[PDB]
């Protein structure tokens, strides 16, 4: 009906009430806020941990249970984050070992989009990033390319906006999920170098910058 629910299954959230384009996916256990805005047998919701808005099919209501304990965001110090980055990187490596393909809006696995892999990898240790690549760029602390260290985010796009993100490893290498047309159709490793293969070069040409995760996302009120 209305208010805070928790999901009992992985749920697809869409950009619009038409439900033709996936915006994100809400892993079982996550909390969401259900509004009274119904259109086209869908309902407008937002996810509690990242404030991400979308549309849920009304047929997924059987997979919602009312929350009895409200979601309250945990606070991480920069040191706490630093200690968890090994697990974040390991998540991406484990993901790369599964059969996977790029999935627009993919967030629960095994199929991810670029910003969805980042969110999932950080959320596997309880750190919340916003969902979209341009939001991740805005949420992290900008650093120079020279300052990149393992677990920093690398941003790519146009001069106007970030449209792609990856996770830095070492010595120019980074892990990301990339699409069929420009990339690898799933998770792989590229290098920020003109000495890379053709896929690497194509992303290198689009490099915008880099960011460091220094806090976990605290939801707006509300």
CB of 18 to Cl ion, least distance (A): 5
| 38 touches, from Na ion, Cl ion, a copy of itself, none (C-beta below 5 to 8 Å by class) | none
User: Is residue 57 close enough to count as binding Cl ion by CB under 5 A?
Assistant: no
- Distance CA(14)–CA(58), nearest Å, equals 12
Determine if 193 is a binding residue for a copy of itself (CB under 8 A): no
Could you tell me the smallest distance in angstroms from the CB atom of residue 149 to Na ion? Answer: 5
CA distance 65 to 145: 45
Q: Give the C-alpha separation, 131 to 134, whole Å.
A: 9
- For Cl ion, which residue of 3, 8, 9, 21 counts as binding (CB under 5 A)? 21
Q: Which helix (H) or strand (E) holds 26?
A: strand 22-26
Q: Which two tokens stand for residue 172?
A: 């120019």
| Full DSSP string of 121-167 | HHHTTT----SSHHHHHHHSEEE-GGG--TT-EEEEE-SS-EEEEEE
Instruction: Identify what 101 binds: a copy of itself, Na ion, Cl ion, none; CB under 5 to 8 Å per kind.
Output: none
Minimum distance, C-beta of residue 42 to Na ion, in the bound complex (Å): 37
Q: Which residue in 4, 10, 16, 134 binds Cl ion (CB under 5 A)?
A: 16
Task: Identify what 39 binds: a copy of itself, Na ion, Cl ion, none; CB under 5 to 8 Å per kind.
Answer: none
In sequence order, what are the beta bridge partners of 10? none
The tokens for 168 are 């830095």
The token pair at 53 is: 């808005």
- Three-state SS for 180? coil
Q: What is the DSSP letter of 215?
A: S
Q: Which is nearer to a copy of itself, 14 or 168 (CB)?
A: 168
Q: Which of residues 31-90 bind a copy of itself (CB under 8 A)?
A: 79, 82-83, 85-90
Binding site for a copy of itself (CB under 8 A): 79, 82-83, 85-91, 93-94, 97, 124, 149-151, 168-171, 173, 175, 189, 191
Q: Which parts of this chain interact with Cl ion (CB under 5 A)? A: 14-16, 18, 20-21
């Amino acid at each position: 009906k209305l208010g805070e629910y928790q999901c009992l299954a992985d749920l697809n959230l869409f950009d619009s009430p038409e439900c033709t384009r996936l915006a994100t996916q809400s892993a079982s256990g996550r909390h969401l806020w259900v509004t009274s805005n119904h259109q086209n047998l869908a309902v407008e919701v937002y996810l509690c941990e990242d404030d991400y808005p979308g549309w849920l099919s009304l047929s997924d209501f059987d997979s919602l249970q009312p929350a009895t304990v409200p979601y309250q965001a945990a606070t991480f110090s920069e040191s706490e984050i630093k200690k968890l980055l090994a697990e974040v990187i390991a998540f991406t490596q484990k993901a790369m070992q599964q059969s996977n393909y790029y999935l627009w809006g993919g967030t629960v696995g095994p199929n991810y989009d670029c910003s969805g892999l980042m969110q999932a990898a950080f959320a596997s240790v309880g750190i919340w990033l916003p969902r979209d690549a341009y939001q991740q760029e805005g949420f992290t602390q900008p650093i120079t390319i020279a300052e990149l260290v393992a677990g920093d985010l690398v941003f790519f796009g146009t001069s106007q906006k970030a449209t792609h993100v990856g996770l830095y490893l070492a010595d120019g290498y980074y892990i990301h999920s990339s699409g069929k047309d420009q990339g690898r159709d799933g998770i792989g490793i590229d290098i920020l170098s003109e000495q890379g293969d053709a896929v690497s070069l194509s992303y290198y040409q689009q490099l915008r910058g880099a960011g460091r995760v220094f806090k976990s996302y605290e939801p707006q009120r509300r």
